[PDB]
Design a binder for this molecule. Sequence first.
Ligand SMILES: Cc1ccc2c(=O)c3cccc(CC(=O)O)c3oc2c1C
Ligand SMILES: Cc1ccc2c(=O)c3cccc(CC(=O)O)c3oc2c1C
Lengths: 182, 182
Amino acid sequence: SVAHGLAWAYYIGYLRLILPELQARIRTYNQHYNNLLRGAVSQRLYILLPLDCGVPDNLSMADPNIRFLDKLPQQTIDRAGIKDRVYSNSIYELLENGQRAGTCVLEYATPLITLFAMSQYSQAGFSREDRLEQAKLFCRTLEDILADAPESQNNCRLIAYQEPADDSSFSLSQEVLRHLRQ
Amino acid sequence: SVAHGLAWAYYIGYLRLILPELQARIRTYNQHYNNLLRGAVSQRLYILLPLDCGVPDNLSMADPNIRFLDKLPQQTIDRAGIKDRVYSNSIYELLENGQRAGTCVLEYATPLITLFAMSQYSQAGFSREDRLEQAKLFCRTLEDILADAPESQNNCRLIAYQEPADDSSFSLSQEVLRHLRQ
Ligand SMILES: Cc1ccc2c(=O)c3cccc(CC(=O)O)c3oc2c1C
Ligand SMILES: Cc1ccc2c(=O)c3cccc(CC(=O)O)c3oc2c1C
């Protein structure tokens, strides 16, 4: 199964690398730019999982109620298969009814890009129906990995959603706010 | 298939983001530091694919006839799912009888880390035998992808190899040089 392997790859090649020092990075940021923030970023990493596998080029453009505010200070990673790579995470403001309702570190799950690409390329032998099935499977597998994972406790949140196409009353910031509220 | 999706993920999420500007980065290196390197690094990316999926902490330590020389100039990435990310590549010295015999951009394919991990974790439901079969299928699938991929014509080379178990005296250094010499 591609989703099974993708979930493990996403965990092994990203999440178990980024999550250990994430809560430290967020506390550090909440220390030094506190005068600037007049608030506090939340502790967890919020990962967007659109089931249609539609990943935009820029998250800032994706919803007018989600707004880029700041970068976390970087993290260079020193491991096998990874040498001197610079990882950065972005911090977003979430608006509700014109007002700031939350601030969190937020990003899309990259393997959805691969699932989407696989459905476009004929050499991959992957249909658009295969795609939705695999995306749900990817979400559930990853969910299960993180439940039992030493690195993943209390510091990572999966936000999976299906977007109606295309009455489009959907709000991405509403969906994130629903998880943030806890 | 796990390998099928890992190969596509490696192409979609690394190789096609890195290959397009590789030669230019190398060409550019062969100038600014031509006086420092006193030679030339070859222009392709050499990807090591150990079938036993053993990927070392430091390649430099996998064979002592493989020594780290220098880093390439950095590339920043502007794609979807990957804003403000800094990628570097490494140049290695290959030794033969104590002297330099070649210079190349060299790295292990990361999905083999994932294949290895999956064989170690119960939750992955993935055996040692599953691992070797999938590693072979990964190489074949990746080959097929690169053969017809726009970004991957003539700037990439796969070095798949199987370590004998009888003699613990196989030479990665020599294997890489065997490809290099053409
Ligand atoms: C741009 C892009 C696209 C797809 C993947 C991916 O499938 C994928 C799968 C497993 C692990 C990674 C590593 C990462 O998210 O940095 C992956 O990264 C991808 C990236 C960076
Ligand atoms: C450290 C590590 C381990 C495993 C993968 C991986 O499986 C994997 C699979 C597909 C794509 C990527 C992205 C990359 O190699 O930068 C992947 O990256 C990994 C990395 C960076």
